[PDB]
């Protein structure tokens, strides 16, 4: 049975403060007794700006019932820093919140603030935790964004070694091996290989990257993630489309496609036709490009009939 906080010895000095909604608010929520009681006492705690262990315990009670309560998370972090609490202990509590499926923008941001303030000399333990946490949801958007932030922040401090970057690409390659359609992992590859400030840009690296992209397309010809990475790659580095056309042309009917294509690969592949059309434009052959856009519009990608007609009209 629940024991109200008014009957708790540790809280006898505190006068709770009711929620000030007005007399007849719209969108009211039918709160449980436990949640209203805790918020009644949080309002009093926050009003007197009390920084204490009982206030800390009260914030944990509240965010367990509502992990999206940004105000109580903000108060919790100021309690931790004001009381000089162990931030490694708090990080272990956050590990449990994930286990028990307590999650929100607010929890992820709490974890980031902890890592920022701890400021470890080597963040490898947090990197490995993030990697493991992605196995229930390998496309969790908050998690991927947090991983980007962690490497960006600690590389700015000079704390990501060449060995660490190398094993991060190894891990990324394994994610894409297990599911080549994971667009989140393709985004991470782009950070590791192209966008991060420390990336190498050489004749060798451009050759390697192109090899990996084309192999990926030949493994899964209908994978939109691989086509988009190819187009972004060529565009980012101002590389011509035409010299690569031999690897693409078999899908319109360096690594080359399998002599018999994989089964369950109906032709043509619409984004292969987009490649061909754009390569025609690169050759200034607008009429040939227009004919490809017309076929995309009327037969091969009809959901986008209007967009492909727009593209056709630009050329004619």
């Amino acid at each position: 049975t629940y024991i109200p906080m008014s009957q708790r010895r540790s809280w006898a000095d505190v006068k709770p403060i009711m929620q000030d909604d007005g007399p007849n608010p719209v969108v009211p929520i039918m709160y449980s007794e436990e949640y209203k009681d805790a918020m009644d006492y949080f309002r009093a705690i926050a009003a007197k700006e009390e920084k204490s262990e009982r206030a800390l315990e009260l914030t944990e009670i509240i965010v367990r019932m509502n992990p999206a309560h940004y105000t109580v998370w903000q108060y919790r972090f100021s309690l931790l820093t004001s009381l000089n609490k162990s931030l490694e202990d708090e990080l272990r509590l956050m590990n449990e919140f994930a286990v028990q499926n307590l999650k929100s923008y607010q929890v992820w941001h709490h974890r980031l603030l902890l890592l920022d303030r701890i400021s470890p000399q080597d963040p490898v333990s947090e990197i490995e935790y993030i990697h493991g946490s992605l196995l229930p949801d390998p496309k969790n958007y908050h998690t991927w964004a947090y991983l980007h932030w962690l490497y960006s922040h600690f590389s700015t401090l000079g704390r990501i070694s060449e060995a660490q970057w190398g094993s991060e690409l190894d891990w990324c390659n394994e994610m894409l091996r297990v599911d080549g359609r994971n667009n989140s992992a393709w985004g991470w590859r782009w950070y590791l290989r192209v966008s991060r400030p420390g990336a190498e840009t050489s004749s060798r690296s451009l050759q390697d990257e192109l090899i990996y992209i084309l192999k990926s397309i030949h493994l899964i010809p209908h994978n939109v993630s691989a086509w988009n990475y190819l187009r972004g790659f060529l565009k980012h580095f101002s590389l011509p489309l035409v010299p690569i056309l031999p690897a693409i042309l078999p899908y319109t009917a360096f690594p080359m496609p399998s002599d018999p294509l994989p089964e369950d690969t109906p032709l043509p592949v619409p984004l292969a036709l987009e490649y061909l059309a754009d390569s025609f434009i690169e050759q200034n052959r607008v009429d040939d490009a227009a004919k490809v856009f017309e076929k995309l519009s009327s037969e091969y990608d009809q959901m986008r009939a209007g967009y492909w007609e727009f593209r056709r009209r630009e050329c004619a």
Binding site: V26, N66, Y70, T71, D179, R181, N183, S225, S297, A305
Partner: protein
Amino acid sequence: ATEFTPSVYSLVSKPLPSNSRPSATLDEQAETEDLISQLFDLTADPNALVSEHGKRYSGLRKQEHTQFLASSFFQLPGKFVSLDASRPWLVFWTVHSLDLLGVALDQGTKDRVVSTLLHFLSPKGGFGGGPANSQIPHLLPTYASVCSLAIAGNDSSTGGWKDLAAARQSIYEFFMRCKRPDGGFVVCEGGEVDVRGTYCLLVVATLLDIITPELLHNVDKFVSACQTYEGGFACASFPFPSSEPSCRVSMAEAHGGYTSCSLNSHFLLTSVPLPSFPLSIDANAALRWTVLQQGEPIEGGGFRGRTNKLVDGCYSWWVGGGAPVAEELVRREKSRKVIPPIFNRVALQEFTLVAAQQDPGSTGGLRDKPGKRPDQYHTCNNLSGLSIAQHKMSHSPSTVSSNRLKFDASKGLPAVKPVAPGGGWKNEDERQNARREIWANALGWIEEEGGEIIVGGKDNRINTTTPVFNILGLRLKPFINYFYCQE
């Protein structure tokens, strides 16, 4: 008007091919294809003259959806305490949906909406997700509260608009406390930084006449660096140092929700007459990314939120509603170097009517996909996207010109006092030119004569929302006119 918007029932439905390479992504995709295509198979084609016998009728069940929303003006069960910090969003989702559905609130209920929201307004600036004695201000409830007051308030002494006007300086000061040197904003004290905050802040600052140069510095650069190699936008960009970063890098994958916020933010900044501002985006790439997210006929022509994930009705607003913005930016660039619909306006309505409505005779409401319960958020965003598909929206240069011609720069509320001494406009000529451009462009969206497409007949028609703002034009115009003292 439909030569290039083929109906989903007129196209061959086929699964995404496997290439003999199974994966978890494909398992989920194929299962969702089966769910959506079977519901379409059970439903009469909305484009038929006489509805088929034995099959479900797809007409928009507006009265069911009204009854679904009516809970808000009574109460919500306890299991939605997870939204206790988002009560202004519960208001907005409800009252904007009712506007779209053409259902009026009586004045007593509108006054309850106004009064509730004003209890969320903190004297030091901004709205929280609940009572000001319980929650600190936050950029996202501030957008939801301001837009809700546009929908439910008025210019009288009990209408809430005069309280907003009196709060302009404090709201501005909250916005400036949120600002980072690199051009991002935290959403609240100690909160996260992403383009949802930028979007919500720029909408409110545009509407309330509180934009200054110090508020906007680097905001364009933060947003532009969110664009990814796929052409959409991520949640945020990271500034590598040495206010003057050496470079900025996007922090996650292109996503429908952040692409909407980024396109809308950038569009609002193009109104501001600052030198070499806003930094450009790749509009062609953004338009390409947008149209590529509309699903195949087997998945009902709804939008997905990112590559190789599942279609979901709420992206009808986030991605569909970004299309007119991307289109206008492309049009500007095409001209600056000197028409068929850009997405399948018919298929998107079919997804809304056939897949996104709750099954008939039930709770009502609209949802993510079949098999998911409807909620207020998917109700609002399905209907907002349906509106964009039904009505051809464009930003009209001649309308903007006419707006400039009628603007009265001698009328207005007190200028905001900047935080830093040099943070304001240089002089009145420049401030008034800024007010004129920002007001005149905010009122530049039109529905094109003869561009209407109402799949299934005119009883399915809903009202016309505005791109960027997502409130009805009949709400936007008197609201923004109030704060700029125009009439």
